[PDB]
């Protein structure tokens, strides 16, 4: 059974998610759009990107469709604007949680800087359509262009397909957000003992939630599947943070908020 303290934990996380996650993306406006030996090998590899088409449905029924060159610099401003919009909701999600507010302001910044990418992938997975390969963001749509096995070779795209195949509830998604946010091993945290105890309570609640609501054999080892996926997300987070910071050093693109979460000072 679920204890009252565990039911209160989920209720505060779900209430935090409802107040800070605009699932319809109705407040995402005024965003930019694409215009109308070694190291060379890394620069070429970092500037690869997936072939994703963009759709913008107008309120009057009109549709704008963008198809990328069948380089990625034309797509960086728009992706940075969506990143900032997602980051604003994530930061708001953390500051409405009582457990996060009670931490020192330096540990709040350290936790947010280490989990902003992971919480963005977790929220974006809830709007991902695995059958059509499309991220439906309100009037915006991001469709993967043509196969699937070769596209599932990229770890982040493979993470999105695997996490969607688990068919998780909204409460399980918001508990992965809490486990990722309250990571005691993030660089710069000072209250590692408090954050570690909080993460363990979030993980126990997720484990108890799965056992009390998913008795089917298809959900066997589901908690361990989720924990292993959250570990892979931290590795994707560390790998793609390095890729973006190498792109920023060549072609600056990061917004002010993205610079703060990356540690960029402006020199
Ligand atoms: C928090 C950092 C951010 C990111 O992760 N965000 C934020 C934007 C949407 C969600 C997610 C993402 O990217 O979701 C996309 C799917 C949704 C999407 C698709 C195309 C878009 O536009 C054409 C777009 O526009 C909003 C949004 C995704 C999913 C899986 C693998 C992906 O890349 C794998 C790879 O190429 O290595 C990408 C990011 C910014 C980048 O530059 C500013 C970037 O440089 C390219 C990048 O590379 C990975 C990531």
PDB file of N, CA and C in Angstrom, residues 94-141:
ATOM      1  N   UNK A  94      10.702  23.259 -10.259  1.00  0.00           N
ATOM      2  CA  UNK A  94      11.527  22.932  -9.088  1.00  0.00           C
ATOM      3  C   UNK A  94      11.205  23.887  -7.948  1.00  0.00           C
ATOM      4  N   UNK A  95      11.035  25.167  -8.247  1.00  0.00           N
ATOM      5  CA  UNK A  95      10.839  26.190  -7.194  1.00  0.00           C
ATOM      6  C   UNK A  95       9.437  26.130  -6.575  1.00  0.00           C
ATOM      7  N   UNK A  96       8.512  25.351  -7.132  1.00  0.00           N
ATOM      8  CA  UNK A  96       7.176  25.199  -6.488  1.00  0.00           C
ATOM      9  C   UNK A  96       7.170  23.951  -5.601  1.00  0.00           C
ATOM     10  N   UNK A  97       8.223  23.138  -5.652  1.00  0.00           N
ATOM     11  CA  UNK A  97       8.319  21.954  -4.756  1.00  0.00           C
ATOM     12  C   UNK A  97       8.876  22.425  -3.415  1.00  0.00           C
ATOM     13  N   UNK A  98       8.272  21.976  -2.321  1.00  0.00           N
ATOM     14  CA  UNK A  98       8.718  22.347  -0.982  1.00  0.00           C
ATOM     15  C   UNK A  98      10.111  21.802  -0.689  1.00  0.00           C
ATOM     16  N   UNK A  99      10.402  20.586  -1.155  1.00  0.00           N
ATOM     17  CA  UNK A  99      11.705  19.984  -0.890  1.00  0.00           C
ATOM     18  C   UNK A  99      12.826  20.759  -1.572  1.00  0.00           C
ATOM     19  N   UNK A 100      12.573  21.273  -2.777  1.00  0.00           N
ATOM     20  CA  UNK A 100      13.590  22.027  -3.499  1.00  0.00           C
ATOM     21  C   UNK A 100      13.761  23.430  -2.927  1.00  0.00           C
ATOM     22  N   UNK A 101      12.662  24.059  -2.499  1.00  0.00           N
ATOM     23  CA  UNK A 101      12.745  25.400  -1.924  1.00  0.00           C
ATOM     24  C   UNK A 101      13.541  25.413  -0.627  1.00  0.00           C
ATOM     25  N   UNK A 102      13.517  24.315   0.121  1.00  0.00           N
ATOM     26  CA  UNK A 102      14.179  24.253   1.416  1.00  0.00           C
ATOM     27  C   UNK A 102      15.688  24.084   1.308  1.00  0.00           C
ATOM     28  N   UNK A 103      16.222  23.941   0.104  1.00  0.00           N
ATOM     29  CA  UNK A 103      17.650  23.766  -0.102  1.00  0.00           C
ATOM     30  C   UNK A 103      18.345  25.116  -0.215  1.00  0.00           C
ATOM     31  N   UNK A 104      19.652  25.166   0.044  1.00  0.00           N
ATOM     32  CA  UNK A 104      20.394  26.415  -0.165  1.00  0.00           C
ATOM     33  C   UNK A 104      20.320  26.860  -1.618  1.00  0.00           C
ATOM     34  N   UNK A 105      20.415  28.178  -1.820  1.00  0.00           N
ATOM     35  CA  UNK A 105      20.285  28.732  -3.165  1.00  0.00           C
ATOM     36  C   UNK A 105      21.422  28.262  -4.062  1.00  0.00           C
ATOM     37  N   UNK A 106      22.587  27.962  -3.481  1.00  0.00           N
ATOM     38  CA  UNK A 106      23.688  27.435  -4.279  1.00  0.00           C
ATOM     39  C   UNK A 106      23.420  25.996  -4.699  1.00  0.00           C
ATOM     40  N   UNK A 107      22.799  25.208  -3.820  1.00  0.00           N
ATOM     41  CA  UNK A 107      22.453  23.837  -4.179  1.00  0.00           C
ATOM     42  C   UNK A 107      21.267  23.790  -5.131  1.00  0.00           C
ATOM     43  N   UNK A 108      20.376  24.780  -5.057  1.00  0.00           N
ATOM     44  CA  UNK A 108      19.282  24.857  -6.018  1.00  0.00           C
ATOM     45  C   UNK A 108      19.806  25.127  -7.422  1.00  0.00           C
ATOM     46  N   UNK A 109      20.808  26.000  -7.539  1.00  0.00           N
ATOM     47  CA  UNK A 109      21.398  26.292  -8.841  1.00  0.00           C
ATOM     48  C   UNK A 109      22.197  25.095  -9.343  1.00  0.00           C
ATOM     49  N   UNK A 110      22.912  24.416  -8.442  1.00  0.00           N
ATOM     50  CA  UNK A 110      23.713  23.264  -8.846  1.00  0.00           C
ATOM     51  C   UNK A 110      22.832  22.111  -9.312  1.00  0.00           C
ATOM     52  N   UNK A 111      21.703  21.887  -8.634  1.00  0.00           N
ATOM     53  CA  UNK A 111      20.800  20.815  -9.042  1.00  0.00           C
ATOM     54  C   UNK A 111      20.119  21.141 -10.365  1.00  0.00           C
ATOM     55  N   UNK A 112      19.719  22.400 -10.556  1.00  0.00           N
ATOM     56  CA  UNK A 112      19.054  22.785 -11.796  1.00  0.00           C
ATOM     57  C   UNK A 112      20.015  22.739 -12.977  1.00  0.00           C
ATOM     58  N   UNK A 113      21.278  23.114 -12.757  1.00  0.00           N
ATOM     59  CA  UNK A 113      22.256  23.093 -13.838  1.00  0.00           C
ATOM     60  C   UNK A 113      22.614  21.679 -14.272  1.00  0.00           C
ATOM     61  N   UNK A 114      22.405  20.685 -13.412  1.00  0.00           N
ATOM     62  CA  UNK A 114      22.776  19.322 -13.739  1.00  0.00           C
ATOM     63  C   UNK A 114      21.637  18.482 -14.278  1.00  0.00           C
ATOM     64  N   UNK A 115      20.399  18.922 -14.055  1.00  0.00           N
ATOM     65  CA  UNK A 115      19.225  18.150 -14.440  1.00  0.00           C
ATOM     66  C   UNK A 115      18.318  18.863 -15.433  1.00  0.00           C
ATOM     67  N   UNK A 116      18.683  20.064 -15.889  1.00  0.00           N
ATOM     68  CA  UNK A 116      17.815  20.798 -16.806  1.00  0.00           C
ATOM     69  C   UNK A 116      17.642  20.054 -18.125  1.00  0.00           C
ATOM     70  N   UNK A 117      18.727  19.480 -18.651  1.00  0.00           N
ATOM     71  CA  UNK A 117      18.626  18.708 -19.885  1.00  0.00           C
ATOM     72  C   UNK A 117      17.791  17.450 -19.683  1.00  0.00           C
ATOM     73  N   UNK A 118      18.014  16.738 -18.576  1.00  0.00           N
ATOM     74  CA  UNK A 118      17.300  15.487 -18.343  1.00  0.00           C
ATOM     75  C   UNK A 118      15.811  15.728 -18.133  1.00  0.00           C
ATOM     76  N   UNK A 119      15.455  16.758 -17.361  1.00  0.00           N
ATOM     77  CA  UNK A 119      14.042  17.068 -17.164  1.00  0.00           C
ATOM     78  C   UNK A 119      13.391  17.552 -18.452  1.00  0.00           C
ATOM     79  N   UNK A 120      14.166  18.169 -19.346  1.00  0.00           N
ATOM     80  CA  UNK A 120      13.620  18.585 -20.635  1.00  0.00           C
ATOM     81  C   UNK A 120      13.318  17.380 -21.517  1.00  0.00           C
ATOM     82  N   UNK A 121      14.196  16.375 -21.505  1.00  0.00           N
ATOM     83  CA  UNK A 121      13.944  15.163 -22.278  1.00  0.00           C
ATOM     84  C   UNK A 121      12.773  14.378 -21.705  1.00  0.00           C
ATOM     85  N   UNK A 122      12.639  14.358 -20.376  1.00  0.00           N
ATOM     86  CA  UNK A 122      11.544  13.622 -19.752  1.00  0.00           C
ATOM     87  C   UNK A 122      10.195  14.251 -20.081  1.00  0.00           C
ATOM     88  N   UNK A 123      10.121  15.584 -20.075  1.00  0.00           N
ATOM     89  CA  UNK A 123       8.866  16.253 -20.404  1.00  0.00           C
ATOM     90  C   UNK A 123       8.559  16.149 -21.892  1.00  0.00           C
ATOM     91  N   UNK A 124       9.579  16.292 -22.740  1.00  0.00           N
ATOM     92  CA  UNK A 124       9.376  16.186 -24.178  1.00  0.00           C
ATOM     93  C   UNK A 124       8.977  14.780 -24.603  1.00  0.00           C
ATOM     94  N   UNK A 125       9.288  13.765 -23.793  1.00  0.00           N
ATOM     95  CA  UNK A 125       8.886  12.405 -24.130  1.00  0.00           C
ATOM     96  C   UNK A 125       7.380  12.217 -24.011  1.00  0.00           C
ATOM     97  N   UNK A 126       6.716  13.023 -23.178  1.00  0.00           N
ATOM     98  CA  UNK A 126       5.277  12.882 -22.993  1.00  0.00           C
ATOM     99  C   UNK A 126       4.483  13.402 -24.184  1.00  0.00           C
ATOM    100  N   UNK A 127       5.091  14.223 -25.039  1.00  0.00           N
ATOM    101  CA  UNK A 127       4.448  14.720 -26.247  1.00  0.00           C
ATOM    102  C   UNK A 127       4.989  14.033 -27.494  1.00  0.00           C
ATOM    103  N   UNK A 128       5.768  12.968 -27.328  1.00  0.00           N
ATOM    104  CA  UNK A 128       6.365  12.252 -28.447  1.00  0.00           C
ATOM    105  C   UNK A 128       5.437  11.133 -28.906  1.00  0.00           C
ATOM    106  N   UNK A 129       5.247  11.030 -30.219  1.00  0.00           N
ATOM    107  CA  UNK A 129       4.437   9.976 -30.820  1.00  0.00           C
ATOM    108  C   UNK A 129       5.381   8.954 -31.442  1.00  0.00           C
ATOM    109  N   UNK A 130       5.507   7.792 -30.797  1.00  0.00           N
ATOM    110  CA  UNK A 130       6.431   6.771 -31.277  1.00  0.00           C
ATOM    111  C   UNK A 130       5.943   6.096 -32.552  1.00  0.00           C
ATOM    112  N   UNK A 131       4.633   6.091 -32.803  1.00  0.00           N
ATOM    113  CA  UNK A 131       4.111   5.448 -34.004  1.00  0.00           C
ATOM    114  C   UNK A 131       4.304   6.307 -35.247  1.00  0.00           C
ATOM    115  N   UNK A 132       4.303   7.630 -35.096  1.00  0.00           N
ATOM    116  CA  UNK A 132       4.493   8.542 -36.213  1.00  0.00           C
ATOM    117  C   UNK A 132       5.835   9.261 -36.172  1.00  0.00           C
ATOM    118  N   UNK A 133       6.629   9.061 -35.121  1.00  0.00           N
ATOM    119  CA  UNK A 133       7.909   9.730 -34.992  1.00  0.00           C
ATOM    120  C   UNK A 133       7.774  11.237 -34.957  1.00  0.00           C
ATOM    121  N   UNK A 134       6.838  11.735 -34.151  1.00  0.00           N
ATOM    122  CA  UNK A 134       6.508  13.153 -34.142  1.00  0.00           C
ATOM    123  C   UNK A 134       6.395  13.652 -32.711  1.00  0.00           C
ATOM    124  N   UNK A 135       6.991  14.812 -32.444  1.00  0.00           N
ATOM    125  CA  UNK A 135       6.827  15.518 -31.176  1.00  0.00           C
ATOM    126  C   UNK A 135       5.750  16.577 -31.384  1.00  0.00           C
ATOM    127  N   UNK A 136       4.547  16.301 -30.889  1.00  0.00           N
ATOM    128  CA  UNK A 136       3.409  17.196 -31.060  1.00  0.00           C
ATOM    129  C   UNK A 136       3.416  18.224 -29.934  1.00  0.00           C
ATOM    130  N   UNK A 137       3.781  19.457 -30.262  1.00  0.00           N
ATOM    131  CA  UNK A 137       3.869  20.550 -29.296  1.00  0.00           C
ATOM    132  C   UNK A 137       2.829  21.608 -29.653  1.00  0.00           C
ATOM    133  N   UNK A 138       1.565  21.302 -29.394  1.00  0.00           N
ATOM    134  CA  UNK A 138       0.507  22.258 -29.677  1.00  0.00           C
ATOM    135  C   UNK A 138       0.381  22.473 -31.172  1.00  0.00           C
ATOM    136  N   UNK A 139       0.502  23.730 -31.599  1.00  0.00           N
ATOM    137  CA  UNK A 139       0.472  24.062 -33.018  1.00  0.00           C
ATOM    138  C   UNK A 139       1.800  23.794 -33.716  1.00  0.00           C
ATOM    139  N   UNK A 140       2.795  23.280 -32.999  1.00  0.00           N
ATOM    140  CA  UNK A 140       4.086  22.920 -33.561  1.00  0.00           C
ATOM    141  C   UNK A 140       4.220  21.404 -33.619  1.00  0.00           C
ATOM    142  N   UNK A 141       4.916  20.923 -34.647  1.00  0.00           N
ATOM    143  CA  UNK A 141       5.136  19.496 -34.832  1.00  0.00           C
ATOM    144  C   UNK A 141       6.543  19.272 -35.359  1.00  0.00           C
TER     145      UNK A 141
END
